A paper describes a structure:
NMR studies in the 1970s demonstrated that aromatic side chains can undergo ring flips—that is, 180° rotations of the χ2 dihedral angle (Cβ–Cγ axis)—even when engaged in stabilizing interactions in the hydrophobic core. Here we capture ring flipping events of a buried tyrosine residue in the SH3 domain of the JNK-interacting protein 1 (JIP1). Our data therefore suggest that the conformation of the aromatic ring at position 526 is determined by steric interactions dictated by the size of the surrounding amino acids.
Accordingly, we designed four different mutants of JIP1-SH3 (H493A, V517A, V517L and A541L) and obtained their high-resolution structures by X-ray crystallography. Of note, three mutants (H493A, V517A and A541L) induce a staggered conformation of Y526, with χ2 dihedral angles ranging from −41° to −75°, whereas V517L shows an eclipsed conformation of Y526 and an almost identical structure to the wild-type protein. The H493A and V517A variants show almost identical crystal structures and for a subset of residues, the chemical shifts of which are unaffected by the mutations, the resonances of the two variants fall on a straight line together with the resonances of the wild-type protein. This suggests that they are in fast–intermediate exchange between two conformations represented by the crystal structures of the wild-type protein and of the H493A/V517A variants. In agreement with this, both variants show line broadening and chemical exchange contributions as detected by 15N and 1HN relaxation dispersion. In addition, the analysis yields exchange rates between the staggered (canonical β-strand) and the eclipsed (classic β-bulge) conformation of kEX = 2,830 ± 70 s−1 (H493A) and kEX = 6,800 ± 300 s−1 (V517A), compared to kEX = 2,600 ± 70 s−1 determined for the wild-type protein.
Numbering used by the authors:
A (entry chain AAA): 491 to 548
B (entry chain BBB): 487 to 548
Write the structure that this text describes.
């Protein structure tokens, strides 16, 4: 699934992904807690973030 | 200065990390914005829990 960061996200935890507004992401929703596992296509970084910081694109 | 403020959870937040604060929608919170990453240090006034959450998941009410 592809998505776009709708808000800036600065990690507090090492497993997290830094997001800038409008970063294109490849994304798997983790249904147990509504975090995304993500790849930031701008930065090449991989990590998790809380799902409400991005929206799915089609 | 980012002074303490009253807030409400606008989204459900389930921790992945031990230092995090569980939110339910419309939880009243006492909140101090941490400027280095825009996480809130927070007290959940419903649950009595202490912890951090990302700022987008609540709205200031003061
Ligand atoms: O006497 C302790 C400090 O009290 C104030 O700080 C608290 O209250 C503030 C106003 O609501 C908050 O912004 C802050 O988060 C609290 O620590 C005061 O501002 C400080 O100068 C005092 O040292």
């Amino acid at each position: 699934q592809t998505a776009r960061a709708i808000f800036r996200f600065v990690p507090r935890h090492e497993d997290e992904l830094e997001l800038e507004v409008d970063d294109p992401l490849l994304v798997e929703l983790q249904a147990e807690d509504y975090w995304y596992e993500a790849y930031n296509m701008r930065t090449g970084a991989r990590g998790v973030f809380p799902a409400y910081y991005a929206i799915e694109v089609t």
